Protein backbone atom coordinates (compact mmCIF):
# COMPACT_ATOMS: atom_id res chain seq x y z
CA UNK A 1 0.00 0.00 0.00
CA UNK A 2 0.91 3.71 -0.07
CA UNK A 3 1.45 6.22 2.75
CA UNK A 4 -0.89 9.21 2.62
CA UNK A 5 -0.77 12.18 4.96
CA UNK A 6 -3.28 14.64 6.35
CA UNK A 7 -2.64 18.11 7.70
CA UNK A 8 -5.60 19.58 9.57
CA UNK A 9 -5.08 23.29 10.15
CA UNK A 10 -6.91 26.01 12.04
CA UNK A 11 -6.16 29.72 11.78
CA UNK A 12 -5.70 31.93 14.85
CA UNK A 13 -5.49 35.73 15.06
CA UNK A 14 -3.11 37.06 17.71
CA UNK A 15 -2.81 40.31 19.66
CA UNK A 16 -0.87 41.50 22.73
CA UNK A 17 -1.60 39.40 25.80
CA UNK A 18 -2.31 40.56 29.35
CA UNK A 19 0.01 38.84 31.79
CA UNK A 20 0.13 40.32 35.31
CA UNK A 21 -0.37 44.08 35.39
CA UNK A 22 -0.64 44.97 31.73
CA UNK A 23 -0.24 44.31 28.00
CA UNK A 24 2.86 42.69 26.51
CA UNK A 25 4.24 42.17 23.00
CA UNK A 26 6.30 39.27 24.40
CA UNK A 27 3.27 37.03 24.78
CA UNK A 28 0.43 36.83 22.27
CA UNK A 29 -3.21 35.98 22.91
CA UNK A 30 -4.60 34.12 19.92
CA UNK A 31 -8.27 33.42 19.20
CA UNK A 32 -9.82 30.98 16.74
CA UNK A 33 -13.10 29.17 16.23
CA UNK A 34 -13.62 25.52 17.15
CA UNK A 35 -16.47 23.44 15.73
CA UNK A 36 -18.79 22.31 18.52
CA UNK A 37 -21.38 20.75 16.21
CA UNK A 38 -20.59 19.46 12.74
CA UNK A 39 -22.05 21.65 9.98
CA UNK A 40 -23.98 23.79 12.49
CA UNK A 41 -21.98 25.81 15.01
CA UNK A 42 -18.56 26.94 16.17
CA UNK A 43 -17.46 28.95 19.21
CA UNK A 44 -14.53 31.18 20.08
CA UNK A 45 -11.47 29.73 21.82
CA UNK A 46 -7.95 30.96 22.58
CA UNK A 47 -4.30 29.94 23.02
CA UNK A 48 -1.11 31.69 24.14
CA UNK A 49 2.04 32.00 22.02
CA UNK A 50 5.39 33.00 23.53
CA UNK A 51 8.48 33.71 21.42
CA UNK A 52 11.59 34.88 23.36
CA UNK A 53 0.89 44.32 10.19
CA UNK A 54 -1.30 41.39 11.24
CA UNK A 55 -0.08 38.47 13.35
CA UNK A 56 -1.43 35.01 12.52
CA UNK A 57 -0.74 31.44 13.63
CA UNK A 58 -1.76 28.26 11.87
CA UNK A 59 -2.04 25.30 14.22
CA UNK A 60 -1.66 22.05 12.29
CA UNK A 61 -1.91 18.45 13.38
CA UNK A 62 -0.82 15.78 10.94
CA UNK A 63 -1.54 12.06 10.71
CA UNK A 64 -0.86 9.32 8.18
CA UNK A 65 -2.63 6.22 6.90
CA UNK A 66 -1.82 3.38 4.53
CA UNK A 67 -4.14 2.99 1.55
CA UNK A 68 -4.13 1.54 -1.94
CA UNK A 69 -5.11 4.75 -3.69
CA UNK A 70 -5.83 8.45 -3.08
CA UNK A 71 -9.59 7.96 -3.29
CA UNK A 72 -9.55 5.46 -0.43
CA UNK A 73 -7.39 7.76 1.69
CA UNK A 74 -9.71 10.65 0.91
CA UNK A 75 -12.71 8.76 2.25
CA UNK A 76 -10.74 7.82 5.37
CA UNK A 77 -9.48 11.36 6.03
CA UNK A 78 -12.89 12.89 5.33
CA UNK A 79 -14.49 10.68 7.96
CA UNK A 80 -11.61 11.30 10.37
CA UNK A 81 -12.10 15.04 9.98
CA UNK A 82 -15.87 14.95 10.53
CA UNK A 83 -15.51 12.68 13.58
CA UNK A 84 -13.00 15.12 15.08
CA UNK A 85 -14.92 18.27 14.18
CA UNK A 86 -12.53 19.42 11.48
CA UNK A 87 -14.08 21.33 8.58
CA UNK A 88 -12.64 23.70 6.00
CA UNK A 89 -11.23 23.91 2.49
CA UNK A 90 -9.61 20.71 1.23
CA UNK A 91 -6.70 20.21 -1.13
CA UNK A 92 -4.68 17.26 -2.38
CA UNK A 93 -1.11 17.14 -3.66
CA UNK A 94 -0.59 13.92 -5.59
CA UNK A 95 3.17 14.36 -5.76
CA UNK A 96 3.51 14.21 -1.97
CA UNK A 97 0.36 12.13 -1.37
CA UNK A 98 -0.74 14.78 1.12
CA UNK A 99 -4.23 16.04 1.89
CA UNK A 100 -4.78 19.29 3.75
CA UNK A 101 -7.92 20.62 5.35
CA UNK A 102 -7.78 24.22 6.54
CA UNK A 103 -10.21 26.17 8.68
CA UNK A 104 -10.57 29.95 8.65
CA UNK A 105 -7.90 30.93 6.09
CA UNK A 106 -9.95 33.96 5.06
CA UNK A 107 -8.26 35.64 8.03
CA UNK A 108 -4.87 35.51 6.31
Amino acid at each position, epitope marked *: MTTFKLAACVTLRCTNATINGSLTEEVKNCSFNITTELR*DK*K*QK*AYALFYRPSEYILINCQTTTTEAVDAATAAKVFKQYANDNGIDGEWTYDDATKTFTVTEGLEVL
Partner: antibody, heavy 136, light 111 residues
Framework: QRLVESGGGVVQPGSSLRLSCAASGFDFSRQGMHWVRQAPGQGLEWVAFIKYDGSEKYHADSVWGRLSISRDNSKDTLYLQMNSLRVEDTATYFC??????????????????????????????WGKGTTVTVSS | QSALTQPASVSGSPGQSITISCQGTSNDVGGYESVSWYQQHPGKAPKVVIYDVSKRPSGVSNRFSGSKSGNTASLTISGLQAEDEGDYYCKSLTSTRRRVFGTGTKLTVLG
Protein backbone atom coordinates in the same frame (compact mmCIF):
# COMPACT_ATOMS: atom_id res chain seq x y z
CA GLN B 1 -38.64 37.13 28.69
CA ARG B 2 -39.19 39.10 31.80
CA LEU B 3 -37.07 41.31 34.07
CA VAL B 4 -38.10 42.37 37.57
CA GLU B 5 -36.03 45.03 39.36
CA SER B 6 -35.97 45.60 43.12
CA GLY B 7 -33.95 47.14 45.95
CA GLY B 8 -35.05 50.74 45.41
CA GLY B 9 -36.13 53.40 47.90
CA VAL B 10 -34.85 56.54 49.60
CA VAL B 11 -31.21 56.63 50.67
CA GLN B 12 -28.80 59.05 52.33
CA PRO B 13 -26.36 60.93 50.15
CA GLY B 14 -23.00 59.19 50.52
CA SER B 15 -24.46 55.83 51.52
CA SER B 16 -24.66 52.63 49.47
CA LEU B 17 -27.42 50.63 47.78
CA ARG B 18 -27.62 47.37 45.85
CA LEU B 19 -30.24 46.97 43.12
CA SER B 20 -31.32 43.52 41.92
CA CYS B 21 -32.95 42.24 38.75
CA ALA B 22 -34.39 38.73 38.51
CA ALA B 23 -34.51 37.44 34.93
CA SER B 24 -36.83 34.72 33.64
CA GLY B 25 -38.10 33.24 30.38
CA PHE B 26 -34.80 33.27 28.51
CA ASP B 27 -31.29 31.83 28.74
CA PHE B 28 -29.70 34.39 31.00
CA SER B 29 -26.18 33.04 30.86
CA ARG B 30 -25.88 33.56 27.09
CA GLN B 31 -27.01 37.21 26.92
CA GLY B 32 -25.55 40.60 27.82
CA MET B 33 -27.40 42.97 30.13
CA HIS B 34 -27.54 46.71 30.78
CA TRP B 35 -28.68 49.16 33.38
CA VAL B 36 -30.34 52.31 32.05
CA ARG B 37 -31.70 55.11 34.25
CA GLN B 38 -34.14 57.96 33.79
CA ALA B 39 -34.55 60.89 36.17
CA PRO B 40 -38.17 62.03 36.48
CA GLY B 41 -39.08 64.24 33.53
CA GLN B 42 -35.64 63.70 31.96
CA GLY B 43 -34.20 61.51 29.21
CA LEU B 44 -32.67 58.04 29.14
CA GLU B 45 -29.09 57.65 30.32
CA TRP B 46 -27.08 54.50 29.70
CA VAL B 47 -25.39 53.28 32.88
CA ALA B 48 -23.51 50.02 32.30
CA PHE B 49 -23.24 46.85 30.21
CA ILE B 50 -21.95 43.43 31.20
CA LYS B 51 -21.13 40.43 28.96
CA TYR B 52 -23.03 37.16 29.27
CA ASP B 53 -20.19 35.58 31.29
CA GLY B 54 -19.33 38.66 33.38
CA SER B 55 -15.81 38.74 31.95
CA GLU B 56 -16.15 42.34 30.73
CA LYS B 57 -17.98 45.42 32.00
CA TYR B 58 -18.43 48.96 30.69
CA HIS B 59 -19.72 51.99 32.59
CA ALA B 60 -20.73 55.52 31.63
CA ASP B 61 -18.19 58.16 32.65
CA SER B 62 -20.80 59.99 34.71
CA VAL B 63 -21.32 56.93 36.97
CA TRP B 64 -17.81 55.47 37.00
CA GLY B 65 -16.48 54.80 40.49
CA ARG B 66 -19.94 54.95 42.04
CA LEU B 67 -22.17 52.54 40.11
CA SER B 68 -20.87 49.12 39.12
CA ILE B 69 -22.59 46.24 37.37
CA SER B 70 -22.28 42.54 38.10
CA ARG B 71 -24.26 39.34 37.68
CA ASP B 72 -24.80 35.88 39.13
CA ASN B 73 -25.64 33.42 36.36
CA SER B 74 -26.51 30.65 38.81
CA LYS B 75 -29.31 32.87 40.18
CA ASP B 76 -30.27 34.47 36.85
CA THR B 77 -29.73 37.80 38.62
CA LEU B 78 -28.21 41.10 37.53
CA TYR B 79 -26.93 43.61 40.10
CA LEU B 80 -26.06 47.28 40.30
CA GLN B 81 -23.88 48.26 43.26
CA MET B 82 -24.29 51.93 44.10
CA ASN B 83 -21.71 53.66 46.31
CA SER B 84 -21.30 57.21 47.60
CA LEU B 85 -24.62 58.23 46.10
CA ARG B 86 -25.34 61.80 45.03
CA VAL B 87 -28.71 63.54 44.93
CA GLU B 88 -28.21 63.51 41.14
CA ASP B 89 -28.36 59.70 41.02
CA THR B 90 -32.07 59.99 41.82
CA ALA B 91 -33.92 58.17 39.05
CA THR B 92 -35.83 55.16 37.87
CA TYR B 93 -33.37 52.35 37.18
CA PHE B 94 -34.18 49.85 34.42
CA CYS B 95 -32.73 46.37 33.94
CA UNK B 96 -32.39 45.77 30.17
CA UNK B 97 -31.51 42.87 27.86
CA UNK B 98 -29.05 43.31 25.00
CA UNK B 99 -30.43 41.58 21.92
CA UNK B 100 -27.94 39.08 20.53
CA UNK B 101 -27.34 35.81 18.76
CA UNK B 102 -24.81 34.01 16.54
CA UNK B 103 -22.79 35.53 13.72
CA UNK B 104 -23.38 33.83 10.37
CA UNK B 105 -20.56 32.96 7.96
CA UNK B 106 -19.73 30.10 5.58
CA UNK B 107 -22.73 27.96 6.55
CA UNK B 108 -21.98 28.23 10.27
CA UNK B 109 -23.37 30.04 13.30
CA UNK B 110 -20.47 31.54 15.27
CA UNK B 111 -20.71 32.16 18.99
CA UNK B 112 -18.51 33.87 21.55
CA UNK B 113 -16.48 32.02 24.18
CA UNK B 114 -18.50 29.37 25.99
CA UNK B 115 -21.24 29.58 23.33
CA UNK B 116 -22.32 33.07 24.39
CA UNK B 117 -24.21 35.43 22.09
CA UNK B 118 -22.64 38.19 20.06
CA UNK B 119 -24.32 41.56 20.61
CA UNK B 120 -26.89 42.82 18.10
CA UNK B 121 -26.62 46.32 19.57
CA UNK B 122 -30.16 47.06 20.64
CA UNK B 123 -32.25 46.50 23.76
CA UNK B 124 -35.14 44.09 23.28
CA UNK B 125 -36.44 43.57 26.84
CA TRP B 126 -36.95 46.08 29.69
CA GLY B 127 -38.10 45.75 33.26
CA LYS B 128 -40.63 48.18 34.72
CA GLY B 129 -37.85 49.81 36.74
CA THR B 130 -37.16 50.61 40.39
CA THR B 131 -36.97 54.14 41.78
CA VAL B 132 -34.06 55.50 43.78
CA THR B 133 -34.36 58.83 45.60
CA VAL B 134 -31.20 60.26 47.15
CA SER B 135 -31.99 62.77 49.89
CA SER B 136 -30.68 63.61 53.37
CA GLN C 1 -19.16 60.20 25.05
CA SER C 2 -21.44 63.25 25.00
CA ALA C 3 -25.17 62.59 24.47
CA LEU C 4 -26.30 62.39 20.83
CA THR C 5 -28.07 65.53 19.60
CA GLN C 6 -31.80 65.45 18.83
CA PRO C 7 -34.34 68.22 18.35
CA ALA C 8 -36.43 68.78 21.49
CA SER C 9 -39.71 68.70 19.60
CA VAL C 10 -41.22 67.67 16.26
CA SER C 11 -44.89 67.62 15.32
CA GLY C 12 -47.22 66.95 12.40
CA SER C 13 -50.93 66.50 11.66
CA PRO C 14 -52.39 63.03 11.25
CA GLY C 15 -51.26 61.49 7.94
CA GLN C 16 -48.11 63.62 7.86
CA SER C 17 -44.58 62.29 7.39
CA ILE C 18 -42.11 63.51 10.01
CA THR C 19 -38.39 62.96 10.51
CA ILE C 20 -36.32 62.98 13.70
CA SER C 21 -32.58 63.41 13.51
CA CYS C 22 -29.85 62.15 15.81
CA GLN C 23 -26.33 63.55 15.50
CA GLY C 24 -23.22 61.82 16.78
CA THR C 25 -19.54 61.75 15.96
CA SER C 26 -17.43 59.43 13.81
CA ASN C 27 -16.72 57.30 16.88
CA ASP C 28 -20.36 56.34 17.42
CA VAL C 29 -23.08 57.25 14.93
CA GLY C 30 -20.74 57.64 11.98
CA GLY C 31 -18.47 54.77 12.97
CA TYR C 32 -21.02 51.96 13.04
CA GLU C 33 -24.25 50.63 11.52
CA SER C 34 -25.49 50.20 15.10
CA VAL C 35 -27.93 53.13 15.61
CA SER C 36 -31.27 52.18 17.24
CA TRP C 37 -34.44 54.09 18.18
CA TYR C 38 -36.87 53.76 21.07
CA GLN C 39 -40.44 54.94 21.56
CA GLN C 40 -41.59 55.74 25.12
CA HIS C 41 -45.11 56.47 26.36
CA PRO C 42 -45.94 57.95 29.80
CA GLY C 43 -45.28 55.68 32.76
CA LYS C 44 -43.89 52.89 30.59
CA ALA C 45 -40.53 51.47 29.58
CA PRO C 46 -39.16 52.41 26.13
CA LYS C 47 -39.61 50.00 23.23
CA VAL C 48 -37.34 49.56 20.21
CA VAL C 49 -38.91 50.62 16.89
CA ILE C 50 -35.74 50.47 14.73
CA TYR C 51 -32.26 48.92 15.05
CA ASP C 52 -29.07 48.58 12.97
CA VAL C 53 -30.13 51.98 11.60
CA SER C 54 -32.73 50.69 9.10
CA LYS C 55 -34.25 47.47 10.43
CA ARG C 56 -37.68 46.84 11.94
CA PRO C 57 -38.16 44.35 14.76
CA SER C 58 -41.17 42.11 14.20
CA GLY C 59 -44.45 43.79 15.15
CA VAL C 60 -43.41 47.28 14.10
CA SER C 61 -45.34 48.56 11.06
CA ASN C 62 -43.62 49.78 7.91
CA ARG C 63 -44.69 53.33 8.69
CA PHE C 64 -41.42 53.36 10.64
CA SER C 65 -38.12 53.58 8.80
CA GLY C 66 -34.59 54.81 9.44
CA SER C 67 -31.51 55.95 7.58
CA LYS C 68 -28.03 57.31 8.24
CA SER C 69 -25.87 59.86 6.43
CA GLY C 70 -22.44 60.68 7.84
CA ASN C 71 -22.67 61.36 11.60
CA THR C 72 -26.43 61.95 11.50
CA ALA C 73 -29.10 59.26 11.72
CA SER C 74 -32.79 59.84 11.04
CA LEU C 75 -36.01 58.16 12.08
CA THR C 76 -38.97 58.67 9.77
CA ILE C 77 -42.62 58.01 10.50
CA SER C 78 -45.18 58.20 7.68
CA GLY C 79 -48.96 58.29 7.87
CA LEU C 80 -48.72 59.75 11.35
CA GLN C 81 -51.38 58.45 13.75
CA ALA C 82 -52.42 59.64 17.21
CA GLU C 83 -50.79 56.64 18.92
CA ASP C 84 -47.34 57.64 17.60
CA GLU C 85 -47.30 60.59 20.03
CA GLY C 86 -44.56 60.19 22.65
CA ASP C 87 -40.83 60.52 23.32
CA TYR C 88 -38.25 59.09 20.91
CA TYR C 89 -34.63 58.40 21.79
CA CYS C 90 -31.85 57.34 19.47
CA LYS C 91 -29.00 55.20 20.78
CA SER C 92 -25.62 54.22 19.38
CA LEU C 93 -22.75 51.87 20.05
CA THR C 94 -19.45 53.72 20.53
CA SER C 95 -15.82 52.92 19.76
CA THR C 96 -15.14 52.07 23.42
CA ARG C 97 -17.98 49.51 23.48
CA ARG C 98 -20.09 51.78 25.64
CA ARG C 99 -23.55 52.88 24.51
CA VAL C 100 -24.96 56.38 24.35
CA PHE C 101 -28.49 57.80 24.15
CA GLY C 102 -29.62 60.94 22.37
CA THR C 103 -31.30 63.73 24.32
CA GLY C 104 -34.78 62.73 23.20
CA THR C 105 -37.54 64.28 21.15
CA LYS C 106 -41.19 64.81 22.01
CA LEU C 107 -43.34 63.90 19.02
CA THR C 108 -46.69 65.65 18.99
CA VAL C 109 -49.47 64.62 16.63
CA LEU C 110 -51.32 67.89 16.22
CA GLY C 111 -54.75 67.83 17.85
Amino acid sequence: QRLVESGGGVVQPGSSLRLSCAASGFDFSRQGMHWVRQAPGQGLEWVAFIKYDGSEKYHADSVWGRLSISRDNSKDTLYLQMNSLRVEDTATYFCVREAGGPDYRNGYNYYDFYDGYYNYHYMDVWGKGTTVTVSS
Amino acid sequence: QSALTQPASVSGSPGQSITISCQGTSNDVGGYESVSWYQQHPGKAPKVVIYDVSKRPSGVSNRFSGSKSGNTASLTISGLQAEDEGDYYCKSLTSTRRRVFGTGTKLTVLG
